[PDB]
Amino acid sequence: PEKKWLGTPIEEMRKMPRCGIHLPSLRPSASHTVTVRVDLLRAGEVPKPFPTHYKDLWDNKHVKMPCSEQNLYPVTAGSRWELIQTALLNKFTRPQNLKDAILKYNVAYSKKWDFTALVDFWDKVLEEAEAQHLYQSILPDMVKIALCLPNICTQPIPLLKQKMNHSVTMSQEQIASLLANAFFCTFPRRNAKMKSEYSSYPDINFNRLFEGRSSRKPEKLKTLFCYFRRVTEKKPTGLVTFTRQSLEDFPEWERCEKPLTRLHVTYEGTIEGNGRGMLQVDFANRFVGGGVTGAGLVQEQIRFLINPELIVSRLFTEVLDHNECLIITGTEQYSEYTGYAETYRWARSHEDGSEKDDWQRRCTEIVAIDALHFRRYLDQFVPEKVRRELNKAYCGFLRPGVPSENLSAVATGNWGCGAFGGDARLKALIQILAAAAAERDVVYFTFGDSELMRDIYSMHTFLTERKLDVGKVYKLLLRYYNEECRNCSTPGPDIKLYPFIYHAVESSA
Ligand SMILES: Nc1ncnc2c1ncn2[C@@H]1O[C@H](COP(=O)(O)O)[C@@H](O)[C@H]1O[C@H]1O[C@H](COP(=O)(O)O)[C@@H](O)[C@H]1O
């Protein structure tokens, strides 16, 4: 019978906090927005905002806050925030009470936003006692933190636009307020389908969480209400950093002399569970988070639901271009789940026991890197497409300025494979080569595919023992393309990639 894991023992891999650099004092800079009082930051205490009082910016460089005086609405043009306050400061006892509240300042979507999933969750899924707790405690507590936004999020939040290399660090507390606003659908200019300014950003308002008849919706609702109950009952004290990274220059893949690094590969375990303290890959949509409140419930959405603080990146993160990624450090896990996609179920609250770094960020680092979709299988072997995926992965893994010995292993798996069209064996090798270029080790989860585990180890062991560096491996991929793919008249070649690599090397001088 197969072994459960192969390669370097997972305990020998680097992880946070042990491997981390000594952090300089947290401070704002031209590259780093920081929305809390760094001099007052103390372990276990709720961070205080900077500035002390609300400052507004309503422009094309910053989040358009619902509490802005420039957020206007017909009442003559009146304050939309005053309308939001009035709508939400009402008793809810029936689901239509919450619908009608949200629609008071979203009149234009009265027909377009269905609330069937909210109604059925409230009336059918929840027992009487749980519904009562929802409407007597949770929802009013959520309203309270939502309407505290201007006192909590005092500093304008910059948009992380394409090409920016920039970080925003905010408190978990600040994020809870923003997410409660998202729940009540309060963010202006983020709703219309013919929207202009924000067409290149993901959705942020949670309206689609309430729509349709999917058996998925109640599970998303339980998962998010789990979060909201936690943060309203006990205010979180940590910080979270969101970093957009965009590289213009990449390895010379055909000539790269860096050796392959260590591999641990296994068909059991999870990225979020067994890759604790490691760089955890989110198989992202380029609109980070993808359909987190929509239909989608695969690897990304699941992660955005169990660590809901990730969802706030949608407020300010422009769609990723080919050479970009989003790095999020410090999100907390609030829920546990069982299953996946159509079998996903909220299981219970999670009490996150992760250590915090010196900026009071949980030692949990997640990187969103979007694979390409391959609607024609052979497209992915074309060198341009190999390079694209190498470069995307490389960008997700590289930490400029940071010594390699201070980098954790990368915890990843079958990125963009399955119904997205990626080839698992090609994608494994791509991420192994990108990790090698970034001088990181790899922890690879094959999620039940033991033969794939075996094949990836065998290949990695062969290339390692035969001392082929990144460039030599890359050159073999170009050989496979040129000799077996370029003129292939079938959907896939007769000779597969790993068999080709073995034969090529075994045939060589
Ligand atoms: N994220 C931040 N951005 C900008 N300044 C900050 C931040 N965090 C702390 N400071 C400031 O850096 C200083 C610490 O610098 P040292 O550690 O080197 O000494 C802090 O005192 C903070 O000062 C400002 O906040 C205060 C607001 O006061 P009221 O508006 O309520 O009157 C005011 O003093 C103002 O100057």
Numbering used by the authors: 442 to 516, 524 to 957
Recite the paper's sentences.
To understand what caused the activity difference between the mPARG E748N/Q and E749N/Q mutants, we solved the crystal structures of these mPARG mutants. Interestingly, while E748N and E749N mutants were completely dead, both E748Q and E749Q mutants still retained residual PARG activities. PARG E748Q and E749Q mutants have very similar conformation in the active site, consistent with the fact that glutamine has the similar size of side chain with glutamate. In all above four PARG mutant crystal structures, we were not able to observe the electron density for iso-ADPr at the “active” site of mPARG. For the E748Q and E749Q mutants, this may result from the partial catalytic activities of these mutations and/or the low affinity between PARG and iso-ADPr. Surprisingly, we repeatedly observed electron densities, in an unexpected position, which fit well with the chemical structure of iso-ADPr and refined well when iso-ADPr was built into the densities. In these structures, iso-ADPr sits at the secondary binding site which is far away from the cleft. This secondary binding site is at the mouse PARG exon 5 coded region, and is not formed due to crystal packing as it is far away from any PARG region involved in crystal packing.
Reversal of PARylation is predominantly carried out by poly(ADP-ribose) glycohydrolase (PARG) in nucleus and cytosol, whereas ADP-ribosylhydrolase 3 (ARH3) may play a role in mitochondrial PAR degradation. PARG comprises an N-terminal regulatory/targeting domain and a C-terminal catalytic domain. The mouse PARG catalytic domain has a bean-shaped structure, with the active site in a deep cleft in the middle on the abdominal side.
